[PDB]
Amino acid sequence: SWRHLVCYLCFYGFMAQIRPGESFITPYLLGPDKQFTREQVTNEITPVLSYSYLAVLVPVFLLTDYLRYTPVLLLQGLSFVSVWLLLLLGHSVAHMQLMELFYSVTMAARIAYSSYIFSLVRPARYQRVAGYSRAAVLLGVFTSSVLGQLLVTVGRVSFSTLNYISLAFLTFSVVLALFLKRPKSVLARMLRELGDSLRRPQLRLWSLWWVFNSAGYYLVVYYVHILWNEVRVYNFAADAASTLLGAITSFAAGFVKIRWARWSKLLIAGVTATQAGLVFLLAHTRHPSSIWLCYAAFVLFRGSYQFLVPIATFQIASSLSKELCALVFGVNTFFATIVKTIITFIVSDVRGLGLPVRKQFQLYSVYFLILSIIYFLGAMLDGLRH
Ligand SMILES: Cc1ncc(C[n+]2csc(CCOP(=O)(O)OP(=O)(O)O)c2C)c(N)n1
């Protein structure tokens, strides 16, 4: 129980994120084995992920609290396995949409893991465990991407073989999830407790942070590969180093000692202001001998956000005097994606304000600046109301 509760939980998080084939799904689909064209992949596969993620996220946070966070973690493991089973056995676009549907389920089930670590350990160690699990999750993402590239670049093994390596690892993650300790109108009660909990000032500040800052962070991270492509060993190294830096900063967030009643709004504003300038750095820089600076801007931006996520998870869980840690996590992830979709519609899509990728980032930079000013203002009014 001593070693089991914390070390094994981080070990599961580290090994659940081991996916050599996750970053090479599209090239594997667009390959000699499966013989799929770009139009089928772009128009029939990727949109299914977007729609199914929203339709699966809504039930996932309602059920993970009641069914406890073990079956959903076990469901996440099984759902991931069926994704690669359909990848290695699929022949038509129908199989690919089903595996994209299963893939969307898996991304909806990561809120269960984040809340699971909070139900396992006493509230005293909420901050340290939050830093540990996020560090373990990001260390898994980093070592999955690096081992994924190494097997394909310095290694000569085919995509099908590389996907087999993921399948064996993913089965191991399923086995690991099978030994996780399960902690010991209904809809009206949880919604009523949702409103009562949101009345607290600490959770409300961080929940609003989750909705908006994560939407901006995901917008930057999602519209970053295209931005570099619009301008192949270097666009991964930034991704690999960004996840590594996020792991270190998330690990360091479980050891920071800050009085989370007076310097909470200021810390959010300081990080958001840093991200606002950093995103602007990624945008307004186009010199050929300046791409290294752009990657340097990206890694710290990823680290700055991933530094505050364990803090946000720790504060929300500590401010929730109920077993509703997952429901708030799901609601914030629900609204963050909705806000992310809304900004994409206005800033990127033609029916709204059509801009090229360069113009989008400066729009995202001012979006962060508005967010930073709001938190800076929010801290000042809280400060004058000492
Ligand atoms: C067809 C297809 N299915 C799945 C993927 C993988 N995928 C789609 S959305 C997504 C999440 C975006 O990752 P990111 O924002 O970098 O994650 P984080 O750093 O927050 O863990 C991933 C991994 C893909 N590229 N293509």
Swiss-Prot record:
Effect of K322A: Reduces methotrexate uptake. Reduces IRF3 phosphorylation upon cGAMP stimulation
Keyword Ligase (UniProt): no
Cytoplasmic side: 65-68, 117-130, 257-262, 314-327
Catalytic activity entry: 5-amino-1-(5-phospho-beta-D-ribosyl)imidazole-4-carboxamide(in) + (6S)-5-methyl-5,6,7,8-tetrahydrofolate(out) = 5-amino-1-(5-phospho-beta-D-ribosyl)imidazole-4-carboxamide(out) + (6S)-5-methyl-5,6,7,8-tetrahydrofolate(in); 2',3'-cGAMP(out) + 5-amino-1-(5-phospho-beta-D-ribosyl)imidazole-4-carboxamide(in) = 2',3'-cGAMP(in) + 5-amino-1-(5-phospho-beta-D-ribosyl)imidazole-4-carboxamide(out); 3',3'-cGAMP(out) + 5-amino-1-(5-phospho-beta-D-ribosyl)imidazole-4-carboxamide(in) = 3',3'-cGAMP(in) + 5-amino-1-(5-phospho-beta-D-ribosyl)imidazole-4-carboxamide(out)
Primary location class: membrane
Phenotype for E22A: Enhances methotrexate uptake
Residue ranges crossing the lipid bilayer per the database entry: 7-27, 42-64, 69-89, 94-116, 131-155, 161-179, 203-228, 234-256, 263-283, 290-313, 328-351, 360-384
Alphabetized UniProt keyword annotations: Acetylation, Antiport, Cell membrane, Disease variant, Folate-binding, Glycoprotein, Hereditary hemolytic anemia, Membrane, Phosphoprotein, Transmembrane, Transmembrane helix, Transport
Effect of I45A: Reduces methotrexate uptake
Superkingdom of origin organism: Eukaryota
Residue intervals on the Extracellular side: 28-41, 90-93, 156-160, 284-289, 352-359
Phenotype for K257A: Reduces IRF3 phosphorylation upon cGAMP stimulation
Outcome of swapping I25A: Reduces methotrexate uptake. Reduces methotrexate uptake
Keyword S-adenosyl-L-methionine part of the UniProt annotation: no
Impact reported for Q306A: Reduces methotrexate uptake. Reduces IRF3 phosphorylation upon cGAMP stimulation
Effect of R302A: Reduces methotrexate uptake
Signal peptide: none
Tissue: Placenta, liver, and to a much smaller extent, in lung.
GO terms, biological process: cyclic-GMP-AMP transmembrane import across plasma membrane; female pregnancy; folate import across plasma membrane; folate transmembrane transport; folic acid metabolic process; folic acid transport; methotrexate transport; organic anion transport
Similarity section: Belongs to the reduced folate carrier (RFC) transporter (TC 2.A.48) family.
Protein name: Reduced folate transporter
Shown segment, full-protein numbering: 24 to 457 of 591
